[PDB]
Structures are given as structure tokens and as C-alpha cells.
């Protein structure tokens, strides 16, 4: 029930998880499109304006591998804090906030398990 491949995106290493679900037809193409979407944010990740920014970005482009390839999403609060804490640097570098990152679109993380859950790693 799993088909997890190692995460090869350079900005999504050294996370609590190290694999992601990749549909066969999209492999390689997915990482190309992901690298393109993440590249404007490389200064945010490198200068470390927010603890929440890299987890948020990698949740969208290298999400944790789930049984049956189920979709997961980061919580709205994570998006909101990553945005506010990195907004000064993003404006200094003219980095637009994409439509698919608008924080109001993300879940409140208040749905009954398993809709919202905690994953433990220790």
C-alpha cells in the first residue's frame, strides 16, 4: 500500500520525513515543476526568516508519503506565520505570493481525526 520514493528536491532535505509519493506517469516532471515553483523562495529558505517557511513549502512540493498516496496539507496557521515572518524579505526581493499559497485556502486543522492529526517522529 506504499510506493514511497526518496525526496530529491534540494530545498526539502533534512525534514522529519525523507520520502514522498510520486505517481509513475509524473516522476521527474513533478520535481522539475516543483523546482520551478520553489526557486523564487530560495532566499527565504537560505536566510531563514521563518521556522515555518521550509516546512510549509515542502508540505506543498514534497509532502509526506501516505498509504495509497493520500493527499496531506499544512495548516493555515503555518502558512500565515511563514508569510508574515518572511514578508519583509520577500518584499525586498520582489517575491510574489502565488495564488495556490493564499493562506485562507488552507485548512483550519480542526477536523476530527484523521482529517486533522498529529504525526510523531520520536
Amino acid at each position, epitope marked *: 500500500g506504499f510506493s514511497c520514493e526518496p525526496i530529491t528536491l534540494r530545498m526539502c532535505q533534512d525534514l522529519p520525513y525523507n520520502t514522498t509519493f510520486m505517481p509513475n506517469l509524473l516522476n521527474h516532471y513533478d520535481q522539475q515543476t516543483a523546482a520551478l515553483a520553489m526557486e523564487p523562495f530560495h532566499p527565504m529558505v*537560505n536566510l531563514d526568516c521563518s521556522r515555518d517557511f521550509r516546512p510549509f513549502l515542502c508540505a506543498l512540493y514534497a509532502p509526506i508519503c501516505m498509504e495509497y498516496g493520500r493527499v496531506t496539507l499544512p495548516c493555515r496557521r503555518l502558512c500565515q506565520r511563514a508569510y508574515s515572518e518572511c514578508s519583509k*524579505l520577500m518584499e*525586498m526581493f520582489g517575491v510574489p505570493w502565488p495564488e495556490d499559497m493564499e493562506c485562507s485556502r488552507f485548512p483550519d486543522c480542526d477536523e476530527p481525526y484523521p482529517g486533522t492529526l498529529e504525526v510523531l517522529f520520536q
Partner: nanobody
Amino acid sequence: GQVQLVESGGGLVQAGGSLRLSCAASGSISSINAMGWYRQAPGKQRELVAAITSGGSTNYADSVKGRFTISRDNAKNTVYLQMNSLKPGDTAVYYCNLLYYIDYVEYDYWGQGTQVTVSS
């Protein structure tokens, strides 16, 4: 020591001329940082001109694209603004900025400003 920004290179040129601003950062700073140039004409709002990370990523205001070039020397923590094809509308005080984070705490320093004046 404590962080200090020293600016130099301003002055007066005729339209079409060129100038080079430099901003030297001293003190205990992070080697991963951003340095920028901002400008403010009297009675107007401060506006971004150009910025550059220690990694080399750059951003330019549209009004200066193709005319100004930002660059840095990481060895000496210095940022430069090469200003070509100057226009009277570039007249302003230009400020250097230094922005970095240590354990997600923001450090944001400003230079004293240096005057650029472009005559008709």
C-alpha cells in the same frame, strides 16, 4: 564589535552620467544576509532600489532595471550600486540596508545615507 554601515560614493552628476555607491558593513554580522539600496527624495516615501543576498540573488526596482547594477564583495561585507544613465528623477538620498536573521530573530541595520543629485 557593534554593527556599523559606512556609505560613500554619492555626489553630483549631469544627466546621462554615472556614479558608484559603496556601503561597508563592520561588526559581528551573519555571513548569510541581504544587503539593499533604498532611496528617499525630500518629502517623498522611501523606495527600494535594488537588493542582493550573500548567495548572489538580486532584485531591482523596475525604474532602475538596465541602468543600475548591484553587486557585493562577501570577503569585505561591502555592497555596491553602479548607477549608469542617471536621470534627474534619480535625485535622492540613497540608504544602504543590512538584513539578516539569527535563530529567526531579525537584525535590520541602516546606513546614514549619501546624496545623489542629477542635474538637467
